[PDB]
């Protein structure tokens, strides 16, 4: 069998500053005995971003991740904790097996802030923390009008092909 | 620094083919086993091709075996994917990314896009005239606009709280 990596939860509605606990399961070990390696990778993906590795060997943390971050776990079984959730980590996290072909993704973990009734919750985050939130958004809301283009150019298509025949 | 950069993305029939490119930059290129990763319209991620360093050995899942081929020039820092063969499945991002062969995929491009259209037969549209046709056009432009307009504002309408709570800061 191809190995199959399957993760949970789904998605996950989070505040901010709460721990969150995110697993995914292998189908196969992922270790090699004669390196003691788990060759497992997790990717931070924000909406209208490009995927950004986080973590490999299944536990070391690529350059700049902070160390609220951890990876843990071995073999079959693998954990990514956030100690305490911050606005910036509001992100898809995928898992990764790179031990054998055909590579292979689990469907991911989707942690998103909860909806409040106001914004008044704004005034406990820092200028910093406001600033990147505000700037995430600009990818976002980009990729959903590129779709929206992407749609009509392929309803315009057919229009455009019999104008030219 | 490193840069990956695709380009190749379109609008294709069912069927038909397409050949991305990626351009990279900031590393010894020839070094590197490189790969190809897509994600559907769902958000899934898949694989899709590894090409070893020198270029001799090609790895790909049964998905697109035997319809896409990766393939690479190292002295011109390129990394290629040519899908044939088109399905209404491969339309998806398409993202460059170095890694493969034994190791994660530590740096990744910007993606370039590959939809494949419906396949519906629109013959019937060569009975009509082109002012017809034009007129038809014409009033998809509006509609495009309308539809942007709203992601606009829905995006706006998530700016302007955070944009505010900035402003009382200081
Ligand atoms: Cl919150
Ligand atoms: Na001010």
């Known amino acids: 069998m191809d190995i199959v990596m399957s993760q949970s939860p789904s998605s996950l509605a989070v505040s901010v500053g709460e721990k969150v606990t995110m697993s995914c399961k292998s189908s196969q070990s992922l270790l090699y005995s004669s390196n003691q390696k788990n060759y497992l990778a997790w990717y931070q993906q924000k909406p209208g971003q490009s995927p950004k590795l986080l973590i490999y060997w299944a536990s070391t943390r690529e350059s700049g991740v902070p160390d609220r971050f951890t990876g843990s776990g071995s073999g079959t079984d693998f954990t990514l904790t956030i100690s305490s959730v911050k606005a910036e980590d509001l992100a898809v996290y995928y898992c990764?097996?790179?031990?054998?072909?055909?590579?292979?993704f689990g469907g991911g973990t989707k942690l998103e802030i909860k909806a409040g009734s106001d914004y008044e919750f704004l005034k406990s985050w820092t200028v910093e923390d406001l600033q990147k939130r505000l700037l995430a958004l600009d990818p976002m809301c980009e990729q959903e009008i590129e779709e929206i283009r992407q749609k009509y150019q392929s309803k315009r298509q057919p229009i455009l092909d019999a104008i030219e025949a | 620094e490193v840069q990956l950069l695709e380009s190749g993305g379109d609008l294709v029939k069912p069927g038909g083919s397409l050949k991305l490119s990626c351009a990279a930059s900031?590393?010894?290129?020839?070094?590197?086993?490189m790969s190809w990763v897509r994600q559907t319209p769902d958000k899934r991620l898949e694989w899709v091709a590894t090409?070893?360093?020198?270029?001799?050995?090609?790895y790909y899942p049964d998905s697109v075996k035997g319809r896409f081929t990766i393939s690479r020039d190292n002295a011109k820092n390129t990394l290629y994917l040519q899908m044939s063969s088109l399905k209404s499945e491969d339309t998806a991002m398409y993202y460059c990314?170095?890694?493969?062969?034994?190791?994660?995929?530590?740096?990744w491009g910007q993606g370039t896009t590959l939809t494949v259209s419906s396949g519906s037969d629109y013959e019937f549209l060569k009975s009509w005239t082109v002012e017809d046709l034009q007129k038809r056009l014409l009033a998809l432009d509006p509609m495009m606009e309308q539809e942007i307009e709203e992601i606009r504002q829905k995006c706006q309408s998530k700016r302007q709280p955070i944009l505010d709570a900035i402003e009382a800061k200081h």
């Open positions: 990314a170095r890694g493969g062969e034994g190791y994660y995929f530590d740096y």
């Open positions: 090409i070893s360093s020198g270029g001799s050995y090609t």
């Open positions: 900031g590393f010894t290129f020839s070094s590197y086993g």
């Open positions: 990764q097996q790179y031990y054998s072909y055909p590579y292979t």
